[PDB]
Amino acid sequence: AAKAVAGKDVILAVFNAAGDKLLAVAGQQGLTVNRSKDSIEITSKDTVGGWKSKIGGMKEWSIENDGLYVADAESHKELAKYFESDSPVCVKIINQASKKGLFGGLAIVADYSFEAPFDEAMTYSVKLDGMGALVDLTITEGGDQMP
Amino acid sequence: AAKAVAGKDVILAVFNAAGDKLLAVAGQQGLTVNRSKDSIEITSKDTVGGWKSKIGGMKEWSIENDGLYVADAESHKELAKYFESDSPVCVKIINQASKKGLFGGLAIVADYSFEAPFDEAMTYSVKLDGMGALVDLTITEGGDQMP
Amino acid sequence: AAKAVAGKDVILAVFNAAGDKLLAVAGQQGLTVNRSKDSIEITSKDTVGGWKSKIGGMKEWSIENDGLYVADAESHKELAKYFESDSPVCVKIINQASKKGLFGGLAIVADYSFEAPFDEAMTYSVKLDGMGALVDLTITEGGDQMP
Amino acid sequence: AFEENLYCDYTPGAAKAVAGKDVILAVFNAAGDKLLAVAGQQGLTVNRSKDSIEITSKDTVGGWKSKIGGMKEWSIENDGLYVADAESHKELAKYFESDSPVCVKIINQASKKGLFGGLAIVADYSFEAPFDEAMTYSVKLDGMGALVDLTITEGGDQMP
Amino acid sequence: AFEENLYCDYTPGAAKAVAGKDVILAVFNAAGDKLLAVAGQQGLTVNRSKDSIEITSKDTVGGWKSKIGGMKEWSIENDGLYVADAESHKELAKYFESDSPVCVKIINQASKKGLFGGLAIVADYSFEAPFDEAMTYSVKLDGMGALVDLTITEGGDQMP
Amino acid sequence: AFEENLYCDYTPGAAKAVAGKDVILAVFNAAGDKLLAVAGQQGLTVNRSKDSIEITSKDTVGGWKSKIGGMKEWSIENDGLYVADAESHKELAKYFESDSPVCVKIINQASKKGLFGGLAIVADYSFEAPFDEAMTYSVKLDGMGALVDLTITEGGDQMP
Amino acid sequence: AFEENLYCDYTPGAAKAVAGKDVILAVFNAAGDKLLAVAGQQGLTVNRSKDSIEITSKDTVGGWKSKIGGMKEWSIENDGLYVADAESHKELAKYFESDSPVCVKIINQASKKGLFGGLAIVADYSFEAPFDEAMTYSVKLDGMGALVDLTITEGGDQMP
Amino acid sequence: AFEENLYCDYTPGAAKAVAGKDVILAVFNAAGDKLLAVAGQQGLTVNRSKDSIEITSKDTVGGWKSKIGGMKEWSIENDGLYVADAESHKELAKYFESDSPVCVKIINQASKKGLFGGLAIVADYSFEAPFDEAMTYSVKLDGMGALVDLTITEGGDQMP
Amino acid sequence: AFEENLYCDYTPGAAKAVAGKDVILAVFNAAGDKLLAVAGQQGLTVNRSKDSIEITSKDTVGGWKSKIGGMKEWSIENDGLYVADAESHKELAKYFESDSPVCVKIINQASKKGLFGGLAIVADYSFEAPFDEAMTYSVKLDGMGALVDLTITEGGDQMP
Amino acid sequence: AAKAVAGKDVILAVFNAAGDKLLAVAGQQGLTVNRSKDSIEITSKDTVGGWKSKIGGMKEWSIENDGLYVADAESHKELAKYFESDSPVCVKIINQASKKGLFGGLAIVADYSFEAPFDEAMTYSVKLDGMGALVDLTITEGGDQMP
Amino acid sequence: AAKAVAGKDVILAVFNAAGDKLLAVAGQQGLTVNRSKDSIEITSKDTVGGWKSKIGGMKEWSIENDGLYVADAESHKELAKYFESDSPVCVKIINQASKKGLFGGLAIVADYSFEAPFDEAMTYSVKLDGMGALVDLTITEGGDQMP
Amino acid sequence: AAKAVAGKDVILAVFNAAGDKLLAVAGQQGLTVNRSKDSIEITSKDTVGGWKSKIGGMKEWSIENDGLYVADAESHKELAKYFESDSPVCVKIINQASKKGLFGGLAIVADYSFEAPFDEAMTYSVKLDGMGALVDLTITEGGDQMP
């Protein structure tokens, strides 16, 4: 196999308003994807043993991406438009090395903040909150649009 | 393009009481702009799937700025008046290298505090809470009054 | 005796969908097994002494795992299937040095998250919440299927 | 799911629970040919009560109060998200204004088994519009006659 | 918005939710030519109830209590931030002092569709002045007559 | 405050709020020449209620319950910190023991505009002294007639 | 467990506690041969009350009102997780519809000792299905006669 | 405390607050010569109310309801820590069983001024003993007659 | 404990507090020879109330209602952990079923002083078994006559 | 101007009991002045836009000063009396180099704590909670009594 | 005197199920004996002064022990049985250098978790919650059984 | 003056049961004295200004003391007796260099724990919570017994 995938090869990609171009957000430096599921309590004391009973609940997901900020790139000119208009955004995760998509979904820009240290470059941070199903493209055929 | 914006060129500017001067806050050493949106829950389980559904909620913004404190400069004697008079203040974010405005809005001085360590220079911290819309000047035409 | 067990010799393994193959989670780098019990307070102050009285409650367990992520790994292609289908999953802990099983049980994939730096390899994290009893195999006879 | 099920007991002998995301309230349309699930559902409560008449006779040994059972009533409350365009809510309003009996059913949409069917009356059709929330609706149905239990009676599996 | 909607589905088939910031209360002015949106609105409650008369006959097989639907009534509750200078607030006071029946409407200002219009009486017009908050008002309107549902009836879309 | 108000809109077109620290209760002295602000004020509530007389006639088409406007009453709740030697607090007690009507006014200091004036009786003058807090008082006023709304009428703007 | 029990006293002389996971409500089937434990039990409440008749006679020195004991009543409230297919939950419906009295027993399944057995009527068999949890049931039984305390009377220890 | 009080203003013009730790309830002994402060005082509530009589006549212009003041009443509720051997608690019981009126005075021990004196009867003398706390008592006093305030009337300054 | 007690005052001049772990409820057995402390005690509440008769006559100067105290009543509420085999619990049930008055006493087990003795009726004897806790019990006793206060009367200190 | 103020020149001074002597708190090693205001929420959603509305709240202030502790110092025999007597203390902040006062006000000694390491000298910490207005002496005329 | 006691000399010991043997739990590397007493507040402000009156409340204790985990050690084969059976366990803290016992008690295994990093040895952590009195053997005579 | 006080000279001592002997706790390495006062909020907004009004509340104090633990020392054989017997302890903080007492008061032993690290010596920690007045000896005459 590959035995690893270098972190500099997976990127976040945003669909433009018409959906014609998959713009990779410029200045990407970090990325984390959270996928969680709740747990319900079916603990009813008619069962032998001594262990607590649980089942699976609801699933949700989120994405955090931060990096260097340039305000002129078309990718950052779209994130502002989506943020101000409260429109759902289409996000995809691309392994630009193996040329395969990873995870696509609809998200809402929960945060768009950025910092300007005096001895560094102005860095930006983005949080996207999950809106519906996060389609696992590693288990589902298709989803390989490159840009 | 630019591929980056060095942090020593993004500054915070404040409109004076009359509004005729855009005074740059002296002693600036750090700048953080936070922009957040709430996320509402509409999970009703007559919907197929298995992912917890959300929409985007209400938007808010704020600015933190810290640095060296100078007591006699014009800028620092106006933040005192704004804090004391309980008046909204007009704030702007300026890229003093690219000479483009970034974000302007009305803000409230929520925190105006400072520290005087013995073996260092006496530093100040400022927090401004957003009152209403924060205009993204990177997507809107205008907003370039420099000083 | 052994006086110790090297930490690279203890691994986490998962049963496939039909349960005919025990697959070691590819990319394993860390592991933590948490087993906790509740405590009930029975302080009825008709009792001489002066120390607070307690008894035992219910027992829960969970597993934290993390390591390097390989997308094509069939074990990683099965954890996704278990997470998506909300189906209980059979997990086991193997000491590959002594070829002895340690802990097996049914769990729910509560969290399946992964994060990718810019200067490192893409890492993955898994949280498994106990769906009932976790049978310790070091006290009970059996449980030694190796793969 | 193997090793002779030594620690993983996958044997199905019961469910031990029914997730609330699977019990749904359904209403028959005006024609009675289509079962519609009330859209935006988020809660459901079925109350079944029986009156208790006292028959205490003051010439009996003991010291306990004697009681007998009376009549039975049933009611349903259901709240959730309100979408005024859903045809199910375009059906509830017509029943509310027409003062007509309405046919209601409770479906375990995961077990594909009916639970309780009956004829009820829309006693209250109210809803809330918080400024920072989504508009929620509340529905109260008062029973008109017997609530037929489908867990002990055959049939009642019209799924939609 | 592409890849054949493999993961992003924007297809319009419903709303699936109605944000409460999209539903407002509108009041007709005295002359009836201007619909004023009550300024400072923050909460909205609509109550619609029907009684239940019992006709339990002691000669009916079964064991359940028989009923029919009673009289119908309705009411509105509102509350929000109060300014004494707004014209809409300058109309509620006039109606309250004059005992004049007031025409009220519920507007989905997002979908541009009316919901409920009717004549009501201002039963309660109260307000508070908390020292560490903003002075806020609460209004109760008791329904006089039918609550004309605009979701089933055609028309009633005056937005102002 | 400039750039043609491109992002900072300083135009005053309304208040959009009235902070609760601006609405005070004022009481006329015995002579009626001095308006005293009740010292230590921390909370205020004004209740205005109207009764509803039902005229439901069993010969009306429709299906909704008919009601009209009844009689109107009003009351005021105040609470705050109590200092015994304050002139205002030495006057409410006098009105309380003498059972005399007391003239009350609601004043917005920021707008310098009267809101509501009337005659009331102190139906309750109670206060608590928690050990770990400051001793606070509460006053309940019931009004015998017209609560004149100064937001729609001319005059009545005395500040004290 | 040793060192002459210097710091560890394992001596059994009482229970000093009875965990709630050891008290089970059980029901006799229609035939009366099978004792079924109500599946999904999560809470239990036993209420036993007596009335108090007053005999305050004014010709008695003192100043305290005199009372005696009235009649005795008892009831059981039990709530928990609900599965419709369970055998115990299927008799409760049959008992509830048939008005038939039900024999109920409360058992310390850890001590294998009966506590309270008697006849009761199912006054309420209601249940709720929240959308974000498992659907739960609640049961109320009112006692028609004596509740025999098995802790002071010999017998009554059937385990199922 | 200087620089012409440029920033530090001590100048006494009021108290602006009265700490609750300075307000203590005290009772007169049976002989009436010793004023004892109830030990363990932790809470105090002095309620004073006046009834309202309605004089609504259907021939009055306006549109509001007419009322006057009725009869007045007062009561005191004091709770705190309880010790059995204190003289104050060894005097309250003597009043309680003997059903004798007790003279009560509420005193500001800081300003050395009395506030309210009266004659009351212990209508409720209860106390609580939580296991993980100190045992707490509560007292309710109902007055027979006038509650003479000492803030408007001269005198009543005996401290003990 | 020294340096002339300059900062450490070890002189006992009062208690200033009585922890609730030192106040227990004890009952007399059927023979009346053993004082048994209720096992599993965790709470205790003693209520002592007195009625108030109004004697307001409409020819009295003032404005306050005239009141005189009526009859006196007392009651006790206890709760805590329940163990079935405890002797005190095997005595309480016998009194509950037999309608026999029980002699009850409140004991300060630290100071070895009796507090209150009386005769009571077990009005309520209920207990709960939450699934994630220990089975708890609650007892209500209503007094048939005078509750003898032992803090004012000499005697009554039988400790067990 | 000065472009900065050295931190070893900002000191805290306390008025004595009679108010005749402004004592510099002996042992000063640090100083922090916090000034905060609250924020009221006035979101009325009959207003177009999409950004959250706020107004000015309630203002308060506090000071924390820490350093080395000398018990026999006159200033440390005054703080103890104020702390024990529950009396307001008049505090002032001095730029002892520029001979200009900064802020004066009445405060309550909320905390007076001190810690004594084994291998270092005995240090003390003081917290003063503001009772009312913190008068700024930089935008107001006067207030320059040095001692 | 000794003026110190080495930390490699204090050990935790467990009485087995029969109680005939005192087991030194293998792999010990850390101990923590926490003993706390609650405080009840008796502030009644009829008392002169100005300080908050308190009394002593209820007492409790707990033990934390972490170290290397060798599963085959028969000492660990008793901790597992106690954890699974919810039976109280007799615990003694022993100074193997002075040959004196310190603290005996009846405790419950409230937490039994362990960690397996790939670059270290498998470490285990155990929490024991006190069910009643912790007998201090330093004051009381007896309690000197080592094994 | 002194301008400083060495931390190795501020030492904690407690009184024995009879109170005839002042014993310094053997093995102490640290000491912390906390003295706190509450603050009520009395903002009545009929007042001009714009700041928040506060008065002082109740006062209470506490002591933290940790160091090396030696069991045979008589002083540690007195703290254990107090902790077991729930009796108040008279504690005094003295300056063994200037032979001056600082603070005396009654306290309860709220927390008496200790650590046994593998590569260190056994260390102990003590928390004392006072019931009422902590009389400071630096402003009052007396309290000067060293032993």
Could you tell me the CA-to-CA distances from G89 to D12, D154, G14 in Å, in that order? 19, 16, 35
Residues 6+ away with beta carbon under 8 Å from C48: none
- Regarding chains H and L, contact by 3 or more CB pairs under 8 A is answered as yes
Q: Which residues from chain F sit within 8 angstroms of residue H57, using beta carbons? A: none
Q: Is H1 exposed, middle or buried (0-12, 13-18, 19+ CB in 10 A)?
A: middle
**Is residue C109 a contact partner of residue C126, using CB atoms and an 8 Å limit?**
yes
Looking at CA atoms only, how far is residue J39 from chain D in angstroms?
A: 18
Helix or strand run (H / E) with residue L1: none
Closest CA to K86 of C54, C43, G16: C54
Report how far apart, in Å, the C-alpha atoms of G130 and of each of D24, D25, D46, E92 are.
10, 12, 11, 40
Is F42 close to L40, i.e. CB distance below 8 A? no
Give H3→chain J minimum CA distance, Å: 7
Q: What angle is formed at CA A71 by the lines to CA A68 and CA A77, rounded to 5 degrees?
A: 115
How far from J17 is each of C120, J22, J23, J75, J85, CA to CA, in Å? 64, 10, 11, 11, 11
Query: Are I132 and A44 a contacting pair at CB < 8 A?
Result: no
Chain F contact set for J40 (CB, 8 A):
17, 19
Nearest Cβ partner of E41 from J40, J46, J58?
J46
Which token pair is J121? 């000298």
Tell me how close the Cα of D80 comes to any Cα of chain J, in angstroms: 22
Report the alpha-carbon distance of residue E37 to residue E24 in Å, rounded: 7
The two beta strands, A123-136 and A100-115, are antiparallel
The structure tokens listed for F82 are 């109590």
β-pair type (F136-143, E102-108)? unpaired
Contacts of K40 in chain I (CB under 8 A): 17, 19
* Range 17-76 of B in CB contact (< 8 A) with A: 28-39, 43, 49-56
Q: How was this structure determined?
A: cryo-EM
Separation between Cα atoms, residue K15 and residue K11, nearest integer Å: 13
Residue in chain G lying closest to D40 (CA): G131
Q: What's the rounded Cα separation, in Å, for the pair F88 and I148?
A: 49
Q: How far is H14 from chain L (nearest CA, A)?
A: 12
Residue E83: what residue type? V
| Separation CA E69–CA D123 (nearest Å) | 7
Distance from CA of C39 to the nearest CA of G (A): 12
Q: Which pair of structure tokens corresponds to residue E7?
A: 């993961």
Contact B117, F20 (CB under 8 A): no
Residue C5 near chain A (CB below 8 Å): no
* E99-158 residues touching F, CB cutoff 8 A: 99, 101, 121-135, 142-147
- Residue E109 — φ and ψ, nearest 5°? -65, -10
Report phi then psi at I78, rounded to 5. Answer: -120, 155
Q: C-alpha distances in angstroms, B59 versus A83, G9, J40?
A: 9, 63, 16
> Token digits for E132?
């560490």
Residue C118 in contact with residue A30, Cβ under 8 Å? yes
Cβ F43–E130 below 8 Å, yes or no?
A: yes
Which among C72, C113, C129 has CB closest to A33? C113
Measure Cα distances from G33 to G26, G39, G118, G158 in Å. 13, 18, 15, 10
**CA proximity to B123, closest of J30, I107, J14:** J30
Token digits of residue B11:
């500054």
d(CA I25, CA I42): 10
Q: How many CB atoms lie within 10 A of CB H87?
A: 13
Which value, in Å, is the radius of gyration of the alpha carbons in chain F? 21
Inter-chain CB proximity B135 and F2 less than 8 Å:
no
Please list every residue in chain E whose beta carbon sits closer than 8 Å to the beta carbon of residue A16: 1
Contact call for C44 and H131, based on CB within 8 A: yes
CA distance A119 to chain B (A): 6
Cα dihedral sign, E23-E28-E33-E37:
negative
Collect contacts of G117-120 with beta carbons under 8 A, ≥24 apart.
Answer: G117/G147, G117/G148, G117/G150, G117/G156, G118/G74, G118/G143, G118/G145, G118/G146, G118/G147, G118/G148, G119/G143, G119/G144, G119/G145, G120/G75, G120/G76, G120/G144
Residue D90's H or E segment, with its range, is: helix D89-98
3-state secondary structure chain E: CCCCCCCCCCCCCCCCCCEHHHEEEEEECCCCCCEEECCCEEEEEEEEEEEEEECCCCCCCCCECCEEEEEEEEEEEEEEECCCCCHHHHHHHHHHHHCCCEEEEEEECCCCEEEEEEEEEEEEEEEECCCCCECEEEEEEEECCCCEECCCCCCCCCCC
Contact call for D132 and J44, based on CB within 8 A: no
Find chain I residues with C-beta within 8 A of A45's C-beta: 131-132
Query: Can you list the alpha helix ranges (DSSP code H) found in chain C?
Result: 76-85
DSSP letters for G3-55: STTSS-----S--S--BGGGEEEEEE-SSSS-EEE-TTEEEEEEEEEEEEEE-
